[PDB]
Structures are given as structure tokens and as C-alpha cells.
Design a protein around this ligand. Structure first.
Ligand SMILES: Nc1ncnc2c1ncn2[C@@H]1O[C@H](COP(=O)([O-])OC(=O)[C@@H]([NH3+])Cc2c[nH]cn2)[C@@H](O)[C@H]1O
Ligand SMILES: Nc1ncnc2c1ncn2[C@@H]1O[C@H](COP(=O)([O-])OC(=O)[C@@H]([NH3+])Cc2c[nH]cn2)[C@@H](O)[C@H]1O
Ligand SMILES: [Cl-]
Lengths: 416, 413
């Protein structure tokens, strides 16, 4: 007798489902406008695929189980690995650069509320085979367009930007093997989420000294690009890469949308370079979206030659919270072009004839299926939001006509 | 280093993915043309939901596990019923709901029955008469016709479980054993007569009642139905209406009566149907039927008539590929913006925005590459136009356009 859905999952009845479609049309449209090709993988993947274990939180937050037949498995918590699989699968036949997108469902055994439910759809845009920041620029501009398309602006939403190289330098400059670095990126991401002493505690636990911990704290708090230059020199990849990224987005004309934020690092250990996170200016919700460059990952899965990648994920939850707070998700109710009312059931076969004729003429149309009275029919027309009620009565039908109410006798040739 | 997908699942790279979109787009268009509303549930559901156990094959063919315990859906209908009942008193009827959910059966992989599949579900809820089924069956047809098929390629076989339900009820077996008989009897297509008859004797039934069933299944036409059960009978007059109404709608040649059709799912109550290719090459294209009692079974305080069908994304494709109706249509994009050298990049971007604003689909060379390479890229991604942004021209407020001379920035669109 049980009606509620599993755990923190969402049901999508028509009313809700429309909102989703509205949201998706946009992603697709934006992809197309930006020239991305759609792909998809199976939601269920091999457990083996997600073996990185870089101190992350995603490894245990897994819907994993065993089929017996074939080997053990898990429902995907992110698309990227599944992309990498498909890419590498394509092998020598893979033509580059490639620009691929997808709107896959994703499963994290996570903490339900607020806007981080146990299942979520995630719009992935990825550029593969592009070395320069030209990629990230495009990608970030793609998120913006989408949002702008949804009815947002730079004043509602921002995108914070940074490069992990800045950090990667600082660490490499003190005496710790890149060994412990990715874990530091996991730790350091928590600075937004929790207080400084507990981050600094976990970094001391990873073995690091206090004086190196200090350096990290400082870097994270660095105010601008100009200021980056002074801790690492204007002659430096990270520096000139950001300046290009920023000059290019300003050129494309989304200047107000982005800004530098030294704090941004991301919680996934395969990012190599530039990284970004979409946020609402008021600072109400978790990240709208997040992404960055991941050059080495494809080598990690075993590409005989390393393949640069950048790309982001864009959730379907937080974004909606924001649109609903900005009253940009007005329910647009179901409509249909025509409702065909058989006068009595003897007219039904003629009604059908008429219905076919409209559906052929490319109309969207509906027909009263059970025997019901004339009022009820009109009532139905109103419920389903019909633009027009075509009543098929006999007196008229014999004269080769039907009745039409808009929401007088019309012959068929003048109907459609 | 592992590239292949899990078990009998399909990867969908862009090339394949397009074929899917082409299919789904028809599914959606047809729905809309027929006035269905789209819905979706989570692919993962409670194990509890699929507890019927009417001698079926679907109960063990399950991707079940524990997190309460759960399983990945093998059919949408239960999940629909859940949502419907969930809506409660707020549910407005009749309702016409559709969806294209993925589904997971721990089944037998080849040929056209892979371990995962998408399934287009159309369901009418709250309609007593065959008017529903008619609509539903016409909906499948439209889709197919939309895909480029015809009555000569594909048929839809039709029948009513009441015909059988009578015959059994008329011999002395409780409805108790009936649904199991429908499971057994469905296998007649798939396997030989003696093994069906064996399993029915195993369900307890006599030989003389087994005979009656064999006979009913083989009944040639509706006229003939009349003679074993009277013209005055629900099943008989229901079919005659169904058939007269489809003929009216103008899909006469698409359907036909076949006494053998019963379906392998135990919740069907009345009319049932199955889509097939006339040549008899592949498993059922699609299948459905009326299921009035199911909603009471999940606990509706008043029974709610339903009909609806599922329409797989696998078999159908096998057929379209055999009829050469799935020509690969390769990716294309309106424009490719080539910065002459990297110094023009920021202007190139300016131009790219201007096109994307004008509603064009456009692309831009992202890495530094030579002029030829650019044009080569243009060809690869199938561009209709190459907008080279060179400096001599840019200063005069223009760009170079090659179609696959010099043009002013306001006249690219
Ligand atoms: N529990 C959740 N509930 C609702 N929304 C959620 C949830 N988790 C993630 N998201 C959406 O995905 C974005 C973060 O994805 P990610 O970067 O953590 O995972 C990725 O896939 C990264 N690999 C990004 C990426 C894609 N391609 C390259 N990098 C968030 O902004 C959020 O909107
Ligand atoms: N392994 C497979 N490979 C390819 N195609 C497959 C596979 N399994 C199922 N299908 C598709 O769905 C139909 C069979 O499922 P069904 O109709 O028996 O169960 C149902 O889904 C019921 N819920 C039908 C229904 C819905 N509403 C009322 N009745 C086939 O006609 C085919 O189109
Ligand atoms: Cl879709």
C-alpha cells in the first residue's frame, strides 16, 4: 500500500515533470548552441571503475552491490569516469577535440537535505583534447548561457575561479612529495564548509608541518591575481593561465559573471589545473555547479598518451531551489490543441475520423473516451486546457460539418 | 584499464546516442500528438513493490540488493501505480500519462532482449471502455508510421483474457490457478505444445480442461469466439468495438485478431496486444493491455481501470536497421569561428557570442592551430559555414566567410 519514494529520491508526476523538462530543454539547447554532442552510459557501472581512494568522501558514499553474474557493481555517483571509459574505448577512432555532453542521473549515499538529495540529475559538459584555457572559458560561458537562459543574471549568480597549480606549487616548494597533495586538496576544500582549526588539524595529521600549513592557509586567502603573481611570480603557468581565462571571458561578454576566489579547490582529486564553482550571490545554497581541468585522469585509466580534458557537472536540485526563490519557475500547466467530443456514442466512429484528421494536420488532440454527458466533456476540455472543443454532432455531420467552441458550424475542409 | 560496459548493457556514444534521440523524439511527439503528459519515477525502487509471485519469470530476474532493501525496476507500471495512488484524492481522471524509463531484467542478453532497455510507456487511467485500448494501440501505430514503417512491415495482434477467464471459470478451477495459466499459456509461441500441457497438468488441471484451453488459443476469429462463448458476452462485443473503432480511426490494416496472444504478466484483466514484424523475425516490438484490478491490489479504496503498453528501444531498432530506416545522420553545426592567429581570439569570441545570440549553433577553434587545420575541423564537425576572423578585415569591421567573400559583422545574422 506504500506510496512514498525510496529514501531521498524524488517522484516526478506531470506537474513536477514539466519543471524538469523546462530545465532540460535549456541544457540541451545550450549544448547545441555551443556545439556539444550528446552521449550516455549505463547508470550502473563496475565497482572497479571508481577505485582512486585519494582520501575522498565519494568512495564510501556508494550504492554498491553484487550481481553474482558478471562481477560486482555500483550505481554511478559521477559521469566523468564513465566518460573516460567510453573515450578510451573509442581508442584510435576518437577524433579530437571532442565536445560531449550528457544529463545523467547520479547516486550518492549522501546526507539528503538540504539541496543534496540521495539522487540527482547532473548536466555534464566536457571538452576533450584541448590544452589551453580556451576550453574552460567556453565551458564556463556555457554554464552562464544556460543560467541566463533560465532567467538569471550576473547579480543573482556568480562563478568563482582558481587554479590548483598555485597550490600544487606551494606544496611542491615545501618538502612534501606530490604523494600527499590530492589529499590536501580534499582537506583544503572543507575550508568553506568548516572552521580553520579542524582543517589545520587534519593537515598536521597528514604529516605536514605547521609552517607549511600556514603557507596553505595564506594561499587560500590570497585576494587577487595580481597578488598571486607576488607569491609565485608573474612568469608562471597558473598566473598567465588565469589572466587569459579572465581576458577571454570578458571578450565573450560574460565579465560580471566570473571572479577570482583563491579558496576554490573542489572535492574531487583528479583536477589538475583551473577549477570553478557556481554560486548564488546571497550565499544561500550549496554549489550550483562545479568543474575544472583534469589532464592526467585519462592516463590514470590507461591511455597510451595523456589526453587533456576539462568539464563540469551541473545539478538539477540546487539550481531549482534558486529559481523557485527568485520566482522563475512559474508552473505552466498542461495544454492540448483540441478536444473531440462525440455528441453521443453513435458519433464516436465519426469523432475518431475527425481526431485522426487533426493529429495528421500536426495538431495535438484528445478525445472523450468514456460515454459522458455534454457538460462533462466541456469540463474535461477545460481540465486538460484545450484551446478548442470540436463537438461532433449528427445534424452537422450529415451536412459534413462539426461544431467548434473556442476557449458555430464548421465544415471539415475549413477545420484543418 | 577496463572499457567494456557492465553485463548486457549498452554504452551510448554520440553516434549511437543520436539513433536513440531519433527514437525517443518520435515517442515524445506521438505522446504530445495524442495528448499524453510525461512523468518519471526513480529507477531504483523498494523490493516490496514487486511482490506478486503469480508463477511469473520476472520475480527472480531482478537486480535486487540492500542499502530498507531495494531493486532496480524491471517494469514501470508498478511505479506508476505507486505515483497514481500517491496522488490520492487529488488525482484527476481520466489521466493519460507517459514515460521512457530504463528497465533492468537479469535476463538472457541476446538476441534483442539485453540486460537493460529503455521502454516507452503509454497508460490511460480511469477509462472503462475499449476506447482506451483503441487510442493506445493507435498510438503505437502512429509512432511506428512516424519512424517510417507501414502495416505491411509490422502488425499488432489483439485478444481478450476474458475469453480464457471464462473457459477456465467454466471448468471447475477457482480463479486461484488462472493467472498462472496465463503465464503458462503465453509460452505456446515460444515452445512446443506438450511441455505447456505438461505444466498445466502440473498446476493440477485435468486433460479435458487442458484440451479446452488448447482449442481456445487456436480459435481463428471473433465470429468463432462467439460460438464457444456466445455473441452476448463482454469479451466478444468488446473486441468488435475495439476493431470497429480502430478501423474508424483509419488503422484497419495495422491490427488483427490472434487467439494465441495472452502476455506474460499476471495483472492483465481484459484486452491484450503485442506488436510484431510480419516476417516473424524478432521478439515482440511492444506489448500491453487492460489491467483494472491492479490498483485495488496495491490498495486503492476504489478500483481504478487502467490500460497501457510498453514499447522497447531494442527490437524496434533491429527492425528499422533491417529495413534500412536508420540512416546515420551525422553531427552538424551552423558555424565555425576561426581566429586568424591568436591575437584575433578575443575578437573571434566577440563574433561567436554574436552568432550564438542570433540563435545560431556555433563553435570555435580553441587551441592554436593553422588555417588549414581549422578548415579541416570545420569539415569534421560538419559546419555549414566557416567564419574566419582576420585582422585586415576586422579593422574594416568585417570577417571572412567561406560556405561549405568578405562580410560585415551585422550581416552574419
Ligand atoms: N547530492 C547532490 N544533490 C544535488 N546536486 C548535486 C549533488 N551532488 C552534486 N550535485 C551537483 O553537481 C555539482 C557538483 O558535482 P561534482 O563536481 O561534485 O561531481 C562531478 O561530476 C564532477 N566530476 C564535475 C565534473 C564534470 N566533468 C568534469 N568534472 C554540484 O554543483 C551540484 O549541483
Ligand atoms: N529485454 C528486453 N529487450 C528488449 N525489449 C524489451 C525487453 N524487455 C522488455 N522489452 C520491451 O517491453 C515489452 C515487454 O515488456 P512487457 O510489456 O512484457 O512488461 C511491461 O513493461 C509492462 N509494464 C507493459 C505494460 C505497461 N502498462 C501496461 N502494460 C516488449 O514488447 C519490448 O518492447
Ligand atoms: Cl530526454
Amino acid at each position: 500500500v506504500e506510496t512514498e519514494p525510496v529514501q531521498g529520491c524524488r517522484d516526478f508526476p506531470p506537474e513536477a515533470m514539466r519543471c524538469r523538462r523546462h530545465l532540460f530543454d535549456v541544457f540541451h539547447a545550450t549544448a547545441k548552441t555551443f556545439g556539444f554532442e550528446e552521449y550516455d552510459a549505463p547508470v550502473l557501472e563496475s565497482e572497479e571503475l571508481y577505485i582512486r581512494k585519494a582520501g575522498e568522501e565519494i568512495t564510501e558514499q556508494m550504492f554498491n552491490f553484487i550481481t553474482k553474474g558478471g562481477h560486482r557493481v555500483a550505481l554511478r555517483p559521477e559521469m566523468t569516469p564513465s566518460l573516460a571509459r567510453l573515450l578510451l574505448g573509442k581508442g584510435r577512432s576518437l577524433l579530437l577535440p571532442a565536445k560531449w555532453y550528457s544529463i545523467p542521473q547520479c547516486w550518492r549515499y549522501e546526507a539528503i537535505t538540504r539541496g543534496r538529495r540521495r539522487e540527482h540529475y547532473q548536466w555534464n559538459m566536457d571538452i576533450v583534447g584541448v590544452k589551453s584555457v580556451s576550453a574552460e572559458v567556453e565551458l564556463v560561458c556555457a554554464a552562464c548561457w544556460a543560467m541566463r537562459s533560465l532567467g538569471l543574471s550576473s547579480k543573482d549568480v556568480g562563478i568563482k575561479v582558481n587554479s590548483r597549480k598555485v597550490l600544487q606549487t606551494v606544496v611542491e616548494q615545501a618538502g612534501v612529495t606530490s604523494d600527499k597533495f590530492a589529499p590536501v586538496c580534499v582537506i583544503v576544500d572543507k575550508m568553506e564548509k568548516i572552521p580553520r582549526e579542524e582543517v589545520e588539524a587534519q593537515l598536521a595529521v597528514l604529516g605536514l608541518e605547521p609552517t607549511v600549513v600556514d603557507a596553505i592557509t595564506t594561499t587560500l586567502s590570497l585576494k587577487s591575481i595580481d597578488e598571486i603573481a607576488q607569491r609565485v611570480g608573474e612568469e608562471h603557468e597558473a598566473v598567465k593561465e588565469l589572466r587569459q581565462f579572465f581576458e577571454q571571458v570578458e571578450a565573450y561578454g560574460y565579465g560580471d559573471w566570473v571572479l577570482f576566489d583563491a579558496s576554490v579547490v573542489r572535492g574531487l582529486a583528479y583536477y589538475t589545473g583551473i577549477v570553478f564553482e557556481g554560486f548564488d550571490r546571497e550565499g544561500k545554497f550549496r554549489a550550483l555547479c562545479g568543474g575544472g581541468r583534469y589532464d592526467n585522469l585519462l592516463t590514470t585509466y590507461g591511455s597510451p598518451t595523456p589526453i587533456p580534458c576539462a568539464g563540469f557537472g551541473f545539478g538539477d536540485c540546487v539550481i531549482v531551489e534558486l529559481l523557485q526563490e527568485k520566482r522563475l519557475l512559474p508552473d505552466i500547466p498542461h495544454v492540448v490543441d483540441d478536444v473531440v467530443i462525440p455528441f453521443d456514442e453513435s458519433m464516436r466512429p465519426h469523432a475518431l475520423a475527425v481526431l485522426r484528421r487533426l493529429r495528421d494536420a500536426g495538431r495535438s488532440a484528445d478525445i472523450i473516451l468514456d460515454k459522458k454527458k455534454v457538460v462533462q466533456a466541456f469540463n474535461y476540455a477545460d481540465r486538460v486546457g484545450a484551446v478548442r472543443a470540436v463537438l461532433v454532432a449528427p445534424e452537422e455531420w450529415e451536412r459534413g460539418e462539426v461544431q467548434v467552441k473556442m476557449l458555430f458550424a464548421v465544415p471539415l475542409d475549413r477545420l484543418v
